């Protein structure tokens, strides 16, 4: 019939080459995905075992200290969760600047913060505007699972797949949600990168309300360090 013009032939040939290379890439991706699934399964198993072992070790250490007649001082918290409880109206310069540096720009936003003398002293200046404590494993896991959003190219992307986490944190070995949870809870060597990767959590208003946000938690208010009791507030806020 009609002879095929050379331009159409060239286009078809190049399209065939592109299809072949795409198919090869897809096959390689599928194989590596299978390997990654096995790896993340094993890693999650190991992390769960580690958490259980740490809890048991803490209980045993306390019991042994009591038996010996002495005292065991628990290791100080290495991680904090900070929730803004005041609005953005009528802000003093230093407080506003510190709250931006903590990435708390909206009321009821939440962020993790590694415990440090510099960070602790920064938080001391804004104590009236926030409440914070020591998050639970359940708290961290639920926050990351339900409201965890990653920052890719300065955009907010929901963590619906492990590929989103991988694209940003594969250089550091974090390629799955469980890896991210472990890095956050343990404050691993790459805690900074993983934490910055997490978009500030946008929490809802507390389910049961607040007591009084104009007073410190010690006086019966809500501001300040409420230590292990931050977890119930997180339950009501997530």
């Amino acid at each position: 019939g009609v002879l095929v013009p050379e331009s159409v032939l060239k286009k078809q040939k190049r399209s065939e080459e592109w299809a072949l290379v795409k198919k090869q890439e897809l096959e390689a991706a599928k194989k590596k995905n299978t390997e990654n699934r096995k790896l993340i399964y094993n890693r999650a198993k190991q992390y769960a075992k580690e958490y259980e072992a740490q809890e048991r070790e803490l209980i045993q250490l306390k019991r042994e200290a009591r038996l010996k007649g002495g005292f065991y001082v628990d290791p100080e918290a290495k991680l904090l969760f900070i929730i803004r409880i005041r609005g953005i109206n009528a802000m003093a310069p230093q407080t506003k600047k510190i709250l931006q540096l903590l990435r708390l720009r909206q009321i009821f936003n939440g962020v993790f913060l590694k415990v440090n003398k510099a960070t602790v002293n920064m938080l001391h200046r804004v104590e009236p505007y926030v409440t914070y404590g020591y998050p639970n494993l359940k708290s961290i896991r639920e926050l990351i699972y339900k409201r965890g959003y990653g920052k890719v190219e300065k955009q907010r992307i929901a963590l619906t797949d492990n590929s989103v986490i991988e694209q940003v944190l594969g250089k550091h070995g974090i390629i799955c949600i469980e890896d991210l949870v472990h890095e956050i809870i343990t404050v691993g060597p790459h805690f900074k990168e993983a934490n910055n990767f997490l978009w500030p959590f946008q929490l809802k208003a507390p389910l049961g309300g607040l007591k009084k946000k104009r007073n410190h938690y010690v006086e019966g208010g809500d501001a300040g360090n409420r230590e292990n009791y931050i977890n119930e507030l997180i339950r009501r806020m997530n």
């Binding site: 399964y41 198993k45 699972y145 619906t160 797949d161 469980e178």
Partner: protein
């Protein structure tokens, strides 16, 4: 010299489902959750039977 043409970049955003409610999403994010749930259920059943 042009790079291969792309036709699958404009994918609609995947709807976010909470892994804490539906099982398939949780398994997709964390396959070990299946084993964890299975072991927890079996242990609870064994304890109830023993009681």
């Amino acid at each position: 010299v042009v790079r291969p043409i792309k036709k699958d970049v404009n994918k609609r955003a995947t709807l976010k489902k909470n892994p804490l409610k539906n099982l398939n999403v949780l398994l997709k994010l964390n396959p070990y959750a299946k084993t964890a749930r299975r072991m927890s259920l079996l242990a609870e059943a064994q304890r109830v039977k023993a009681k």
